[PDB]
Amino acid sequence: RKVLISDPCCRKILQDGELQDCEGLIVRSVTADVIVVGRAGTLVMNTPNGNSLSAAELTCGMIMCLARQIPQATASMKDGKWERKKFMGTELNGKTLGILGLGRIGREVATRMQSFGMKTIGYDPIISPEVSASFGVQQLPLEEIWPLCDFITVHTPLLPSTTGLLNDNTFAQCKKGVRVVNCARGGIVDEGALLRALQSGQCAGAALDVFTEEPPRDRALVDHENVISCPHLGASTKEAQSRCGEEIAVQFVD
Template identity: 60%
Template sequence: MAPIPIRTVLISDSVDPRCRAVLEENGIRVTEKQNMKNDELIAEIKDYDGLVVRSATKVTADIIYAANNLKIIGRAGTGVDNVDVDAATRKGVIVMNTPSGNTISAAELTCALLMSLSRNVPQAAMSMKQGNWDRKKFMGAELYGKVLGIVGLGRIGKEVASRMQSFGMRTIGYDPITPPDVSASWGVEQMSLEQLWPQCDYITVHTPLMPSTVGLLNDETFAKCKKGVKVVNCARGGIIDEAALLRALESGQCGGAGLDVFVEEPPKDRSLVDHPNVISCPHLGASTKEAQARCGEDIALQIIDMVKGNSKSSTTLPIPHLKNTFLELCLCEGTSVISEKLRLMEEEVFAKIQIL
């Protein structure tokens, strides 16, 4: 592909220092300004060629249209749900992310929550700190022989499966993109969601947040699950209907939840956070030194590849004939090739969830 002239980049979130270092080593002038309000960013962005964000900055249409020279928006993380991709496309701005940078960290946190749910580790630790010694109260259950349902079998879902299989769990799953024979090679048996719900002792979700996945676990689906099923969400807040989850916890239909993400962050309604059967974290899925270094360096290298015209970047582009749908494309030496793992699901495909 033709080189894209990038001379100045604004970093508006806390990104690993390696990002700035790589960009400056390649002659790009970098400015870092964090915690800007929307109107401040609109005023600041006007003359920059590139913008790098993490999660805090919401790149709205107003910001994109105010950026006279903007050519690239890079998100140092998985997904681009904090970027108005439609507005960027209309203005001819490329949107990039680092879909593999957080994979191991997010998978490890998912596994940690699954294990904590099975043995009540955080609750027991807190009880000890309060001076108690209550062994009976925190009776747990083995993971060995239990069934783990994985909804979304992309990079993270695959890594979770391989790790939990080491504990002797049977892994089943659903994904509208990954072929069943491929997931079978990882030891995951694919099936419809209607078949999956009633079999699971534990469920973990690893899908993008889009209209067809909002409230994927709701009153209706909880009712189809085993009584006492435990659920984990380290993906996006809203995939599990929070009100329905609270009702399921109160009734005992859900035996526990591990939540790293919420619809509103931080959550003002603390009903779930304060529930005794909920283990919650403040969105720590990507919060490891390794993940942040990887994402920071990856997004900088992608920008440099674009500048040199030899991009092998993960670039998110809308598909014109589908509403709110995206394919993750791998731009390899000027040729657009659909990535083997389409982690930003096509809505038309993922909508199958609602009719299976």
């Protein structure tokens, strides 16, 4: 009947069809005291499909950034330095990417980096191999995945079974100087574990959009030279927020 958009595509679709006199509420980025509700992002309702490509484009970005150290080369140049040897990087062609959770973003990531000649292996408890083989991902168990990977990237939801999906046990099986990406949720990579991997050279780089705490209190990872980061930007494009603004409003009419 009456809905507030706490936080222009949404207002229009909803009208076409201070929360004291409100039936519904909409947001993007709701405490127990505050309590149909809708989130523009990934009876409560959200827009699962809206941020899929935009989160998937960031990941490919993180991957190439980790391969050629672009954000650490930029900061070097901006400090007036010309540091050639330091930033000797890695070629993606013929490397093996490991992808955890092959939902909406996993396959978008996988196909894209296939274009760069990356061999894409993967693992997912629900998505079948018949489905993964259709977008060039050979599914194997996690124990056959670790020692093959030059890069590993995570596109699973945050559950107990994924909370610490990459820990010390997993790093111990990976190739020396594995590179790692988390553009999904804070906690799927154990932050405790990723520092130790970084500190011993076991992990060669890391690209984080997400932290168990946001903003992260402990700065051990952010400040580490071989760690590049963003302030949870996976879903920060004009394209994505347009599509999430609609997907939510279309449902509210339904």
